[PDB]
Symmetry: C3
């Protein structure tokens, strides 16, 4: 009965629900006055003026490190695993404290950072990346992480929009067995970033005469050794920005999504205890770069705020072989695996031969995030990896949500449906609206746009320097609710099914076809292992269905077409399928269908996709 | 007591014994009148006019497919395993039915084949080879299979003697990791086959501009897709030829051994139930090409007639490594392994390191066929592979016998002797005759020529187009009996020991030395792993013993000589041993000693053997 | 209570203790009159005139082979393992007898060796090396083994000093996967050995036109085949030399340490039964070349005298991979592993990944010999290899001691201390003396020079041809006792700790710093895996501490320095650490610190060490 009460308590009485959790899970410097700013029009937390734990003061880094060093100093906080097998090591909580303290002082004294500044972070998945981020919040600064792979052009714009006067990177990065010049990329970018005063560089490889030029550049080791190991934290208000995270999804100048401190931290805590049923002696492993909210909230914040161990792997699922991912899971007794479908799709390709010897009884929970997960792949995940006896939480949420939106509970929710994300998390009032006829709440089993009626604490507060794009994008499209950008439907039993962003929905003769269903049914064919249905500027017929299929010399298309009508319908069967080797994806994993749309196709994926359509 | 009765019932009262089994195991279109044509001179089935189930009508393909598709449509019929590991797949009985039906129609409508025509088959061990053969009998045609390795010169003669107006092959064949141009070989051959009207080609690799020329050549896929999936069978008389199989053993124009339909099919059924104790849920694996009776009767007919699953592996025991044979046995839970000694001789060389991890508790029976099996190799087979707790049937029989001649019963016969084939199968009256003084039946423990007193149903009926060679070869050498061509002896306890074809017996001073005993004792020495004793045009001394030994710089011969006298005798010890790297063998496995005789040595084996004798 | 009595019995009443064991463990031809020659000055066995089992007659080879062939002829004596995996084989005791008998006759009749001659042996670890040695004692000859790796210059001098008129070698030696020209090395050496009459060569590889020239050179196989398989032994007096073993340690013309027959043989027997608790059905594996006493006493004499099986491996611990050492231990069910720390140091580097699958429950005892063994390496040895449930005897002894000096008993001694060798063996009266103020016996817990008060039977009797060096080296430095050359100390509980040869002790301001403690503490750091502290001609300060550290770009030295003071003291922390890739070691394993001293650095190790000091 837990979920039924706890969720209603969080919806009709958030003050009591979150007020209590807020004092429970976090250590405060100054108690908060009010829990949230309501919507006077008789309502829950206001969307326009969303704000939680008013006048309250606390410190992220203090909650992620200090309190645990002063309790379980000898317990491990970070468990690292290099790109190469035996190159790992752990960092106790006591030592992380020391490290984050020398770095906090490096920032204040060597670089001149103050409370409120934007610190840009361009690093790979190594411990120093993590302590860097904690060092930034320890001093009341706001970190802005950029994927350690993005072009120097991407780096520049993000720093310029971010107001970042300083930067933090490495000299090079060995990924999946491939070195990557980051310091190089940093310099090309700084040829156009006027406000960059300093650049802290953590030599990871011992560079091949990599640039380093004046008092601008500083050495991580050189500077660290200068400061004591303990440094006092900087209290900040509950509603002061914790960080910024430039989301790089759709077209249009990247958005600097801004998150609160308390509110965001409480969500990461609530989701750890309920969603993953995390304890203190756990070993959480989130296979996602610090480049996206996944890595922010589940490979750094959630785990460290809770006080358990979080695993940092700077490598790839295929390096040095597909058994690698599972080799590091059984030696570290990882109790929490959390990865994206793309990865779970490539591992399922290599064959359960690499999973053979692995007993991996160390796991207790599995999780999926990033995009829809087909049923056969969910089953495969549930049986091969999970040895079918351990939960699987397919977590629905966004960079803006901060934390899980709708997800199954590792324990609270007894049942589970392979393509569903089960139920809305606590505080989230998920409803399905009619995309056409206003913001009408669809009650009976039906498909429509997903939204939340009231705001919650972990909800992003704005978009860096322009609260206008924020409103138009998230609150103006469907006045009164929050616009997720995705389509969904609740089955007879209430479960929620994510249809895959109704922005890529192909409307054939007024039918609106969501991608989730059509593509999953495709990939779920021995002939394929990945599918992507899109569209293009179409005059007549309204809009046709074209599928870019990728196999694992004739009439091979027709089959995949007659199978679409076999279970989905004849008005869903594509008018043309294109055979491609792969699909244009983001470092995150998501498939860029807007690229398949825009034009029928600049990475190598482009050209090959520029030809696989002409003929 | 089973064997004692059942065998006597089948000898003194075959009418009742086989008449009953005949109605039990096979589905008939029109009941047979008489069981067999006796020998009026008071006797069992006549040899000269051998004929069973008179006036009866049935259909092979119907008995191998239909009846089982209409009972257990979802059960697997063929389990394939490509030359490369994970390239396998299964064919249910329902689907095999569909396939064999489209192909039957391809033969009738696209190629013009009629009931009675000879269809030549030149294919590798792939499913299509199997459905092709079934397609041929479904329409009352007679299939003539030729080894997918034989020269184009071999192909031509076999087709010309066979009267084959059509052919069936692939474009190329990847064997043991080596592609083989078959379509090439087919074309060189058809430059001399005047009566070849059509050629059906199943593109297996997607050829590198392989020939295909006029309405003569037809595509398997192109043609198949044209016909419905169900096609009616063609009833044929019990005594109408099922197939022809050109035996390529001794010198002299290859013989087109012709087998009946009913009679041959009943033998394959009797031998499955008793010899292998096969059920319905079994997975039978016969490691022998469709090129010889072994593959006809135990990798196609026996298994499919019984209704279980038969495994089709188109690869080699050494590819991609010696563990391969056992890798496919444990995943498919093969319950019946049946292979030849040559293979069991090369696997025993690699060391029980490849058999280590393998539990292979899926097996229930082991079998040996092809040639004599030494004791140490039988033991090795019995202990390493069999984990000594599962039977081993060393099956004695020929292309002419159709089915097992003398063999141990997987259950019926409680004891077993490593170099013996135990007892004569039901219906077979095996006796040992004196090679010199007439057809005298030797009763007491002694060695002599093997023969059968009366005929049985699975006995070949003739030799294509010349019943004269048939008589001289099989029935005239020892009037009244059937001349096996081998030597044997029954021990005190009755077991029968095959001496290895008394046609290669070296008679030293009137002693007649069979090869079985002398060679087994040789190979059974750590210094060797294969031996071949023969002879040559010898004037004085009568005939000497020369052994071509192959190891796994002096006085190394003498040893192997003093060891021959140690257990066999000083008049058996060879006068000269030749050290060769290997021996001239047939695609079947048998060692060609008549080549070592003929001349002291055209494949590479020739030249090297042309020198290893001069010096 | 066993050890307490047995040891006191052997000290205050050796006549009864050893007299009884002497008749028990050895078969005599003529009983011995007196047990030992005492020191008239009221004492135990005299040092100056040490002699045991007077007037007694026996035969080594008879005690190592014969008696066991005439009891358990079918039991295995030698279990060989080539450098390449599956190239092994065993030699029963019956066959070893035959072999040692044909070789004894080869020596007498083909080469002219007589009782008393010195036979030089230059061979690798192959059976023939072992039978050669036994063949030599069988005829009353004295064998002088030289490492199959030493230069031809080393071979010459050892033969010249040895008086060796004959030699025994192979043509080449495949070691660790590297062929080694020995016959080559033998010939260069014999260009200066005037008294060499013959050279017996056992062709191991079948040479690439390797030299062999006149009646001087003889073939092992050619000669062996000439003699019967049984040949009578030659009785020799208890005190007649068994062998000579040129120790190649410190500087100065190599010493030909001469051992008795009976006395040495009894020690090897006593040490097997008590130290290793050996039985008859055991499989002893001593990983040490026949080049040093270890191989003499524990890979030949001890095992063969006892009547069990001894394993002969002619390969390297790293070939063909680090799992090799353990691969041969589980297949042969080795019950006794005995190796040197250098090896145990390189195997511990590869990671317990090669030890994973290995169950190796066949072991019953582990042993360490050669040099001090750090605690972490002892633990690693005790837990990974021993699966912590099997004893570990860190055996202290020298080439001169013949057999164990102070060691733990596989069973008799219940406790064990990782860096201790426990207690003095029976007959050995170990005491700690003051290096400065005379031969004062230190009683209370303190550090000093190790010595033995009375002699024992296995004690070397002299140094070939110059009993003068013998006295000055072993009995004159500390009159009355035996000078081991090492430093030690007994802890509160009596255990003895070897400090590492007080000849390499760095005396900083009158402190005398033994290497054992300082280096073990160093290597016991994740940053290193091998350490070597030495010194050099130092005027002021007295003598500084310089450590040559080898890792598994600044302030890396300081750490290892602050750690030295952390547990040992600030007056032990080195004044300078040198970073080298490896250390100059002897084929035995011992680290040559006198080379690091002599000069701050001819094998490749020299040059690199000649530079790693200048800068
Ligand atoms: N568990 C999930 N199932 C289906 N879609 C998901 C899931 N998690 C995230 N998404 C989609 O991915 C987007 C979030 O991307 P991002 O902001 O980069 O984390 C949303 O718009 C969702 O539609
Ligand atoms: N199990 C067996 N033991 C000994 N010889 C056999 C065995 N099976 C077949 N043969 C021999 O192989 C010949 C049959 O060859 P084939 O007609 O090609 O099957 C016969 O002449 C037999 O002598
Ligand atoms: N178990 C041991 N522990 C410490 N040092 C040892 C040990 N065994 C032998 N040694 C040293 O090695 C030397 C003997 O070398 P060797 O004569 O070649 O066997 C002695 O001087 C000892 O100091």
């Amino acid at each position: 009965q837990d979920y039924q009460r706890l969720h209603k308590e969080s919806i009709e009485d958030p003050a009591k629900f979150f007020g209590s959790k807020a004092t429970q899970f976090l250590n405060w410097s100054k108690p908060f006055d009010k829990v949230f700013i309501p919507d006077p029009k008789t309502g829950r937390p206001s969307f326009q003026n969303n704000a939680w734990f008013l006048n309250g003061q606390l410190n992220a880094c203090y909650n992620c490190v200090d309190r645990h060093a002063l309790k379980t100093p000898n317990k491990k906080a970070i468990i690292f695993e290099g790109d190469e097998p035996g190159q790992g090591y752990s960092i106790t909580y006591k030592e992380l404290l020391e490290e984050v303290c020398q770095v906090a002082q490096v920032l204040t004294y060597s670089m001149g950072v103050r409370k409120g500044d934007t610190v840009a972070v361009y690093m790979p998945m190594v411990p120093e990346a993590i302590i860097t981020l904690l060092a930034i919040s320890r001093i009341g600064a706001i970190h802005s992480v950029v994927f350690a792979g993005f072009s120097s052009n991407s780096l520049r714009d993000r720093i310029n929009d971010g107001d970042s006067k300083v930067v933090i990177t490495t000299d090079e990065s060995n990924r999946g067995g491939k070195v990557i010049e980051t310091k190089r990329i940093v310099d090309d970018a700084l040829r156009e970033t006027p406000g960059v005063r300093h650049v802290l560089v953590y030599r990871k490889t011992n560079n091949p005469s990599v640039a380093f030029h004046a008092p601008r550049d500083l050495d991580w080791a050189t500077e660290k050794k200068k400061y004591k190991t303990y440094y006092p934290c900087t209290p900040v208000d509950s509603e002061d920005p914790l960080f910024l995270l430039y989301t790089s999804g759709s077209t249009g100048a990247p958005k600097g999504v801004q998150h609160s401190t308390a509110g965001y931290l409480l969500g990461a805590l609530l989701t750890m205890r309920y969603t993953f049923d995390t304890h203190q002696e756990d070993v959480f492993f989130t296979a996602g770069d610090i480049g996206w909210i996944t890595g922010h909230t589940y490979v750094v914040y959630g785990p460290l705020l809770y006080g358990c161990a979080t695993l940092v792997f700077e490598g790839t699922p295929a390096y040095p072989n597909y058994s690698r991912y599972w080799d590091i899971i059984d030696e570290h007794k990882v109790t929490q695996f959390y990865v994206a479908p793309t990865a779970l799709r490539l591992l399922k390709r290599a064959g359960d031969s690499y999973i053979e010897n692995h007993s991996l009884k160390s796991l207790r929970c599995l999780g999926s995030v990033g995009e829809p997960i087909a049923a056969e792949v969910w089953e495969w995940y549930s049986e091969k990896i999970g040895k079918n006896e351990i939960p699987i939480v397919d977590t629905y949420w966004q960079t803006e949500s901060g934390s899980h939106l709708v997800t199954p509970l590792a324990g609270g929710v007894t049942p589970m449906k392979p393509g569903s994300a089960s139920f809305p998390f606590f505080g989230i009032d998920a409803v399905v609206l009619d995309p056409n006829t206003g913001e009408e709440l669809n009650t009976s089993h039906a498909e429509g746009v997903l939204a939340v009626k009231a705001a919650w604490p972990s909800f992003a507060r704005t978009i860096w320097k322009n609260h206008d794009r924020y409103l138009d994008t998230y609150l103006n499209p469907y006045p009164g609710y929050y616009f997720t950008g995705d389509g969904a439907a609740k089955d007879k039993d209430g479960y929620i099914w994510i249809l895959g962003r109704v922005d890529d929905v192909v409307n054939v003769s007024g039918h609106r076809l969501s991608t989730a269903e059509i593509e999953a049914a495709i990939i779920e064919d021995p002939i394929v292992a990945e599918c992507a249905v899109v569209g293009f500027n179409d005059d007549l017929t309204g809009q046709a269905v074209a599928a870019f299929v990728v196999l694992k010399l004739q009439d091979i298309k027709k089959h995949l077409v007659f199978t679409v009508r076999k279970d989905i319908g004849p008005f869903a069967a594509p008018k043309l399928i294109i055979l491609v080797d792969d699909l244009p994806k983001t470092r995150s994993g998501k498939i860029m269908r807007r690229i398949l749309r825009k034009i029928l196709a600049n990475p190598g994926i482009v050209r090959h996709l520029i030809d696989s359509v002409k003929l």
